[PDB]
Symmetry: C3
Subunit: 131 residues, 3 copies
């Protein structure tokens, strides 16, 4: 999967990386993707750049919001996606990301939509097994 | 929805925030999403980092391009999306964004692809009503 | 299509633009999109904020990795996609981007999910021909 993590620049580089490590660990755990199937872009913004409210649920966030956008191939069940959300959020609690400050979106594609390098589509050639 | 607003560094931080306000207000008017259903990421670039032409339409854009990428649930009609493009673009005119300088893309997902916080999928559980 | 290119800050201004040119020429050559159907967002990161391993394929990348995320309407075949992955990489090679350092993902939507400007949906209105 390709994960876009848009967060706040007031978090240290170390915590920033720990967020990335904790997002990956959870995906490996739930999805059971290869350990090295790690593809992440970290973008740190002034808190003014991330506007994230509640959808009228009834809670407020701190300025240190973490948006995690998960780009992954189709096929995962509703319940597996529920486990993703829950596992990401719990991994991020000890590292200083509150449950209220987490927002996750999934966008799907197919296996033939990926090139890991060398101008090759590895799932299509079967060099890389499809999950 | 989650909105990635990619704009340019010459635009005042004040104007950017107003751009982001107009887009949200446009979405709430047309899509009738909850008023606090606000999830935006602003990325200001050196204008040379954004390259947007006309697809051979026959018009020129200023360097100050504003690309809005809307990530929303499937199910909005063709006609509603047109209404969304139009309303976003009229909102931006009085703020300082010319009609030529707006570009909008929609990418679709499902209600089970969202988490608003706390490790929960709110459209799935019933915490939040599906719009 | 809208392209998001995420690369590292140590690449010069000229190389970023040449990376952006090489990617576009690739899509024109293979997809036969209009020459001016060019919509690219470049974001530069500290090599630390881009994490791209190998998925267990068995290779190493340099810190100077380039992630190209293609947003294009559905309809292109698997083979044309394979051919795009190939084209992009072969074009980036003389520009100083190695095969090992290129990662590509495609995400699709529909013709009616695009506004190229003026609050208008050009594929819908017949103004721009469906490729």
């Amino acid at each position: 999967p390709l994960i876009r993590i848009d967060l706040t620049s007031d978090r240290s580089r170390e915590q920033r990386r720990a967020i990335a490590d904790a997002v990956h660990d959870a995906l490996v755990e739930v999805l059971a993707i290869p350990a090295r199937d790690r593809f992440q872009i970290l973008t740190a913004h002034d808190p003014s750049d991330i506007i994230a409210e509640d959808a009228g649920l009834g809670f407020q966030r701190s300025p240190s919001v973490v948006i995690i956008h998960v780009f992954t191939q189709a096929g995962r069940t509703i319940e597996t996606k529920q486990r993703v959300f829950a596992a990401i959020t719990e991994s991020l609690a000890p590292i200083g990301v509150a449950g209220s400050d987490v927002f996750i979106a999934i966008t799907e594609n197919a296996p033939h939509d990926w090139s890991f390098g060398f101008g090759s589509a590895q799932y299509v050639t079967g060099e890389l097994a499809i999950p």
